Amino acid sequence: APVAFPQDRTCPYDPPTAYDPLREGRPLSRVSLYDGRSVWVVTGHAAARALLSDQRLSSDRTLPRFPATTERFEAVRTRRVALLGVDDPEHRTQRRMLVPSFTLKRAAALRPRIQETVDGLLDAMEAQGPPAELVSAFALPLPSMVICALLGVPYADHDFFESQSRRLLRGPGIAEVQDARAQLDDYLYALIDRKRKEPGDGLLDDLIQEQLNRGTVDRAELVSLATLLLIAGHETTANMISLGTFTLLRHPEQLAELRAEPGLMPAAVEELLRFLSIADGLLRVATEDIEVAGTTIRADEGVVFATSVINRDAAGFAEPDALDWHRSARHHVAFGFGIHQCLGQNLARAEMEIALGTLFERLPGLRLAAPADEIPFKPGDTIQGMLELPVTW
Numbered sequence: 001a002p003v004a005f006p007q008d009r010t011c012p013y014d015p016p017t018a019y020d021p022l023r024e025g026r027p028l029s030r031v032s033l034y035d036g037r038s039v040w041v042v043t044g045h046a047a048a049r050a051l052l053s054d055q056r057l058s059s060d061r062t063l064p065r066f067p068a069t070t071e072r073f074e075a076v077r078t079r080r081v082a083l084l085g086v087d088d089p090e091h092r093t094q095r096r097m098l099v100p101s102f103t104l105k106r107a108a109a110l111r112p113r114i115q116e117t118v119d120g121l122l123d124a125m126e127a128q129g130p131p132a133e134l135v136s137a138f139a140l141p142l143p144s145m146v147i148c149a150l151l152g153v154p155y156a157d158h159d160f161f162e163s164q165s166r167r168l169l170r171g172p173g174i175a176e177v178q179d180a181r182a183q184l185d186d187y188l189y190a191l192i193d194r195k196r197k198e199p200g201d202g203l204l205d206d207l208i209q210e211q212l213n214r215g216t217v218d219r220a221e222l223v224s225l226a227t228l229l230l231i232a233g234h235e236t237t238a239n240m241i242s243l244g245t246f247t248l249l250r251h252p253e254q255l256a257e258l259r260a261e262p263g264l265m266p267a268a269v270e271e272l273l274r275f276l277s278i279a280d281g282l283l284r285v286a287t288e289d290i291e292v293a294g295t296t297i298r299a300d301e302g303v304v305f306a307t308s309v310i311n312r313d314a315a316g317f318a319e320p321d322a323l324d325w326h327r328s329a330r331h332h333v334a335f336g337f338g339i340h341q342c343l344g345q346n347l348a349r350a351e352m353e354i355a356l357g358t359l360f361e362r363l364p365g366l367r368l369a370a371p372a373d374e375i376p377f378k379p380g381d382t383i384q385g386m387l388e389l390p391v392t393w
């Protein structure tokens with residue numbers, strides 16, 4: 001019986017034990033999705049990297065044979081997602097409009113603001129006193145506030161858009177997903193319309209001006225790009241901050257090193273990215289045959305990338321299952337690779353460094369406020385992260 005994919009984690013920062021056979025099937029195995037369909041899983045580092053660079057894999061989920069890992073997804077997959085869900089040459093043209101807003105230089109220039117936002121968040125936690133619920137108090141507002149400012153979406157609407165984002169990603173039913181998407185779409189169409197008559201500051205305003213008013217894009221494409229950036233902007237980073245904190249608290253000795261040597265923080269973020277691999281199960285379909293690792297992925301077969309197992313490939317990383325700040329994590333695929341490699345990674349690094357580093361610098365007593373194995377975390381059919389994170393100090 002193939003391993004069923006995906007499955008819930010049991011320890012939120014490790015691959016599930018049910019993936020043990022995938023660890024031994026490297027670089028490539030087969031797996032069963034929810035409707036019984038059989039597809040390729042990619043489990044080796046070298047093969048992941050080859051394949052994520054191969055224009056013979058498609059990310060367009062509207063293709064007839066594109067794999068669906070949930071019923072919910074199967075239902076919405078008749079609609080394209082801008083950028084992430086588009087192939088070259090169109091992917092390329094979209095990316096180019098966005099890239100200037102997401103440079104390393106832009107990220108470095110935002111750091112003072114990131115630092116101030118984090119300081120204000122930890123200040124409020126400290127004013128209210130422990131315990132705190134770290135996801136809602138910190139891990140979520142930092143990146144939500146930041147992407148709102150960067151995009152020109154008002155953080156004042158965060159309760160609405162965060163709520164709809166959750167329903168959108170998680171459902172659980174088709175109806176929840178369609179309702180969330182409609183509410184978000186209508187919110188974003190109104191926003192864009194408002195911005196057309198009275199421009200603000202923000203990437204969305206730049207896209208309207210420098211793109212739409214050239215005829216280079218339309219409004220639906222903007223809504224799609226805006227949804228993708230708003231959601232990836234806040235969800236991925238919040239999950240990295242919350243799961244990162246949880247992981248660090250459960251590895252006292254690695255945490256103590258970062259405490260002594262804060263200069264390690266960039267390397268720790270990169271290692272936390274590899275070790276946690278929250279964006280697990282990336283989806284493609286072959287549109288032509290691809291020979292790889294001595295077999296052939298054939299046209300129309302589903303291909304799923306088991307990011308977590310890949311980033312624990314010993315060929316990729318010595319002692320891959322150790323959390324370590326000194327063995328390079330460079331070349332991990334937690335931000336993907338090739339064509340769709342994370343647009344927001346420069347920003348995401350600055351956020352995680354500043355947030356995690358300041359958190360532990362400022363609340364040196366920090367610790368879990370409930371038993372570890374009672375703290376809820378997200379299921380395996382979505383991007384991994386804590387749902388809550390009770391802490392004290």
Ligand code: HEM
Pocket residue numbers: 059083084085095147228229230232233234236237240278279282283333334335336337339340341342343344345347348
């Ligand atoms: C820890 C934080 C993050 C992680 C782990 C993460 C992970 C990923 C991964 C794995 C991909 C590739 C998806 C695939 O190939 O199917 C991706 C793409 C993307 N990320 Fe992130 N990301 C993070 C933060 C962010 C942030 C802050 C943004 C901000 C807007 C963002 C925007 C995107 C976009 C737009 C893409 C699509 C790129 C393309 O299609 O060309 N990400 N990211």
Ligand SMILES: O=C(O)Cc1ccccc1Nc1c(Cl)cccc1Cl
Pocket residue numbers: 076079081082084168181223224225227228231232
């Ligand atoms: O999947 C959907 O229908 C919702 C949607 C709408 C617009 C843009 C992106 C997305 N979903 C979505 C997002 Cl929000 C982030 C990463 C990957 C995907 Cl498929």
Ligand SMILES: O=C(O)Cc1ccccc1Nc1c(Cl)cccc1Cl
Pocket residue numbers: 084231232235236278279280281282283284382383
């Ligand atoms: O990029 C894909 O193939 C879709 C996919 C599958 C599993 C896990 C994560 C992602 N994408 C995705 C990203 Cl890249 C950022 C935020 C939220 C989501 Cl759902």
